[PDB]
Design a protein around this ligand. Sequence first.
Ligand SMILES: COc1cc2ncc3c(N)nc(-c4cncc(OC[C@@H](N)Cc5ccccc5)c4)cc3c2cc1OC
Length: 274
Amino acid sequence: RKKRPEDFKFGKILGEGSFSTVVLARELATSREYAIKILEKRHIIKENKVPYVTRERDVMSRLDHPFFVKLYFTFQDDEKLYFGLSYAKNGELLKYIRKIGSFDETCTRFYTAEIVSALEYLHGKGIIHRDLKPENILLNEDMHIQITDFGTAKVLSVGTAQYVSPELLTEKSACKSSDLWALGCIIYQLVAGLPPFRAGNEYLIFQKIIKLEYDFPEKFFPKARDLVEKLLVLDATKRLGCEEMEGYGPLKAHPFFESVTWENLHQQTPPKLT
Ligand SMILES: COc1cc2ncc3c(N)nc(-c4cncc(OC[C@@H](N)Cc5ccccc5)c4)cc3c2cc1OC
């Protein structure tokens, strides 16, 4: 039952990283399209990434939720590892952010809610993403979210500069509140069109993060602003959603989510992005 590279018609490259390439592939026997993550074993071994790639596969195996990528199969030849993943026809969220400039209130609320429910599921399994951002949040043919990129994910017993939490720059310590921080950055970015902390280089961005140096544009939705101010908290113990703040209940009960039906989000028809 183990699939082979010969079982597929490989097509365009969807994405490229340091340790992997993601390529569109049509399975010949079924006509099914998969997004196959291809990883060179030699490069992984040379850079000591074996624990990372092992963990990534193990994390993805545990995922059984509509707002996350699914791992359908794995195989390998002499050179390469192949992970068969969900194909998300509409690509990254970042692409839509840049195309329409910024989301209105309805689209912000709906897509924020989908990320919240996804994180609720993820954190309830004791798994932490650690690199949450619009580039890693895909959209399927129905325009529902599909979170991907589990290469730096952590299972409990630095990600991208702009979405890095203060505690990560202090104690070098990562937990659930790091994801919730990144959530606050994403909400801001959906409403404003750009992430909250921006500077000339990485050092200057890190400076702004630890000082909490960011401004809301005047037109920012008041209830969205109020939510962002409760996620972008320097003390990781005081952020909405975290265990010390009594979890996801209070987060979901925030006035910004007033009209949200949380129980069936993935079967609701997504609002048009205009
Ligand atoms: C039509 O457009 C697209 C459709 C797609 N469908 C399914 C996907 C899937 N299951 N996983 C990934 C994915 C898997 N590992 C890591 C990832 O990191 C994204 C970035 N940090 C940079 C990057 C890319 C590739 C490898 C490593 C890092 C992404 C991407 C896609 C995907 C991407 C598409 O366009 C970009």
